[PDB]
Structure formats: structure tokens, C-alpha cells
Amino acid sequence: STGSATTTPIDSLDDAYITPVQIGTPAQTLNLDFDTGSSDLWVFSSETTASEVDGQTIYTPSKSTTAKLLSGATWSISYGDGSSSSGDVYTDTVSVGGLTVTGQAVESAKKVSSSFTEDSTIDGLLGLAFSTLNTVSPTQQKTFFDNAKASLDSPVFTADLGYHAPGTYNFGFIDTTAYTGSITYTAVSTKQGFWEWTSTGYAVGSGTFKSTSIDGIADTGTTLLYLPATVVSAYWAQVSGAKSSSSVGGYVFPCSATLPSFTFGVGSARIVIPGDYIDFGPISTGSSSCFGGIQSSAGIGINIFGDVALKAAFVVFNGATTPTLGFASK
Ligand SMILES: CCNC(=O)CSc1nnc(C(C)C)o1
Numbered sequence: 001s002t003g004s005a006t007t008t009p010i011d012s013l014d015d016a017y018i019t020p021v022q023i024g025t026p027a028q029t030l031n032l033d034f035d036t037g038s039s040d041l042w043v044f045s046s047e048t049t050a051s052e053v054d055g056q057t058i059y060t061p062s063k064s065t066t067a068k069l070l071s072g073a074t075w076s077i078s079y080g081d082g083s084s085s086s087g088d089v090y091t092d093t094v095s096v097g098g099l100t101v102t103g104q105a106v107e108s109a110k111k112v113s114s115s116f117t118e119d120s121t122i123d124g125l126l127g128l129a130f131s132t133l134n135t136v137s138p139t140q141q142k143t144f145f146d147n148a149k150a151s152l153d154s155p156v157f158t159a160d161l162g163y164h165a166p167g168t169y170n171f172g173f174i175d176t177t178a179y180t181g182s183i184t185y186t187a188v189s190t191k192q193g194f195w196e197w198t199s200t201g202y203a204v205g206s207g208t209f210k211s212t213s214i215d216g217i218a219d220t221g222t223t224l225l226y227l228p229a230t231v232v233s234a235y236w237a238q239v240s241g242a243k244s245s246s247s248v249g250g251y252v253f254p255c256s257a258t259l260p261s262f263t264f265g266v267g268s269a270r271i272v273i274p275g276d277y278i279d280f281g282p283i284s285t286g287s288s289s290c291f292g293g294i295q296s297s298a299g300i301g302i303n304i305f306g307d308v309a310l311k312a313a314f315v316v317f318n319g320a321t322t323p324t325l326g327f328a329s330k
Pocket residue numbers: 129130131132143145146149190193319320321322323
């Protein structure tokens with residue numbers, strides 16, 4: 001089997017991408033944030049505290065003839081950005097782009113943190129990191145990818161995120177028309193349960209490539225590119241007037257600037273992020289200070305190849321016995 005679904009930016013900045021997902025019978029379609037940095041499929045639901053729902057579409061398990069309470073199971077997750085959610089668990093039929101999994105754990109939120117309530121466009125998350133990170137207790141549940149893997153034509157999914165445009169998540173096949181050149185594959189560690197790999201270095205603009213190992217994760221659920229402070233300082237030093245602002249929470253730059261590109265290494269291959277992908281616009285409406293798309297990871301504990309980096313590539317998440325990642329230009 002295969003599946004193919006379009007993913008659409010939630011706003012004009014590509015802050016996140018939503019993909020329609022069919023849950024239950026008859027189908028309830030919710031727009032989920034596919035997140036290769038986490039492993040829970042959770043949704044706003046008829047159980048979510050009413051004051052914490054503000055425009056999201058909800059899953060109502062009582063209206064699904066295939067829903068079953070997973071008795072005793074609870075979940076609770078906290079994300080790197082400080083947001084969180086928790087609740088109980090149903091199993092139900094879940095379909096993405098024509099690919100159907102029966103008995104998928106659908107984690108129904110009883111509580112969500114304010115940032116979720118305040119984003120009416122995201123109805124939940126669909127985790128695509130390894131199932132070792134899933135938070136369901138006392139019986140840890142499998143991700144949609146884990147459950148579908150045996151049925152797929154090939155045990156892969158691909159992320160093809162658009163810049164200010166829709167893109168595609170495919171399951172079970174690699175669309176050879178969706179990229180240019182060749183795909184370069186690189187080794188993955190699932191020891192922390194993330195899609196973890198080592199970039200071979202970077203360049204700023206037209207500058208020389210610096211060969212240096214940068215361990216990080218491929219994370220579709222993170223907007224920006226978070227790299228070591230040395231790398232980030234080298235980038236922003238090429239933008240007149242750019243500076244790190246403790247009050248804003250990262251590097252800002254004059255909105256009048258033209259940003260240089262940023263290249264990262266994948267083995268001997270190179271992925272070029274155009275400068276325009278690094279512009280996240282005014283820090284507040286009307287401001288001439290703009291927020292940068294490359295930020296320091298120093299306070300995180302891990303480097304994160306988020307959407308800024310991934311949308312410059314066609315990315316293969318190969319979930320075979322030896323997990324690898326593939327990157328191609330497009
Ligand atoms: C196909 C997705 N599989 C899982 O999420 C299982 S947990 C997991 N942790 N490491 C692995 C292997 C792929 C190395 O698997």
C-alpha cells in the first residue's frame with residue numbers, strides 16, 4: 001500500500017504545516033501537524049476542556065462506530081517549545097492520503113496548553129519519530145508509520161515541504177519526479193528515539209564550506225533551524241545590523257536586509273537554503289526588526305533541522321532495520 005497527502009502552511013510564514021487525516025467511521029477529518037520530532041497522535045476532542053477549544057475541529061469518539069476506549073491508558077506530553085497536552089486514548093481507524101491503519105491509538109486531549117488553544121488551525125499532532133518516544137501509559141503505543149510499515153510497498157515516508165506553498169507527505173514510495181539530481185542517504189541513530197543524523201558542515205552565502213560534524217534531528221514539527229552558536233553567529237555576521245536580542249528571544253535583523261543563503265552538508269552533497277527562507281518577518285506588526293530563521297540551539301541541548309532546512313529538500317525517512325535519512329535538492 002501507499003498514501004499521499006498534501007500538507008499546507010498554516011500561515012504566510014510557514015510556521016507549521018497541516019495535513020488532513022481521516023479518523024473513525026464515518027470519517028472525521030482533522031488537520032494535523034505531522035511531527036517527525038515526536039511519537040504521539042493526539043487530537044482535540046469532545047473530551048477537551050471546553051475553555052481550551054477555540055475554533056479547532058474536534059474528534060468525537062462516540063460518533064465513530066470503530067472507536068474503542070483503550071481502557072486505563074493515559075498520555076501526557078511536553079514539547080521543546082514549552083507546550084503540552086494530555087488525556088486518554090481510543091483506538092480507531094486512521095487514514096492519511098488513502099493509506100489506512102486500523103487499531104491506531106488516537107490520543108484524545110482532555111487538556112491542552114494555551115499555545116494549542118490559540119492556534120485554531122491545528123487540530124492535533126501526528127507523531128512520526130520512533131514509537132520508543134510515545135507517551136501512552138501503561139502500554140506504550142505505536143505511531144501511524146510504525147503501524148503502517150509492514151503494509152507499505154517500501155518502509156519509508158517522505159516529506160516535501162513547500163516554501164510559502166503546499167507540499168506533500170508520501171508513505172510507502174519515493175516519488176522520483178519530486179526532486180532533482182540524486183538522493184544522498186546518511187546514517188540515523190534512534191537511541192534518543194528521534195530521527196538523529198550528522199551533517200557534514202555548512203557554508204554561509206557564497207562562502208567556503210566548513211567541514212564539521214553537526215549532530216541534529218530532522219524535525220518537521222519545529223519551524224526554525226537551530227544550530228550551534230558558532231555556526232549561527234557566523235551566519236548572522238553576514239547580515240548588516242543583525243544581532244541577538246535577549247528580549248525578543250533570538251537573532252533579529254533589519255527587515256530591509258537581503259539575507260544570504262545557508263548551505264548544509266549531507267555526506268558529500270549540499271542542500272542550499274535560500275536567504276528568503278530565513279526571513280520570519282517583523283517581530284510584531286509594523287516593526288522594522290525581523291525575526292531570523294536560523295537560531296542558536298545552545299539552550300536546547302540538541303541541534304534541530306526544522307522546517308527552514310527541511311523545506312529546502314526532498315527528505316526520505318527510511319524506517320528499515322538500518323533507519324536512514326535521504327536528502328535531495330528539488
Ligand atoms: C518503522 C518505525 N519503527 C518504530 O517507530 C519502532 S521504534 C524504533 N526505534 N528504532 C527503530 C528501528 C527503525 C531502528 O525502531
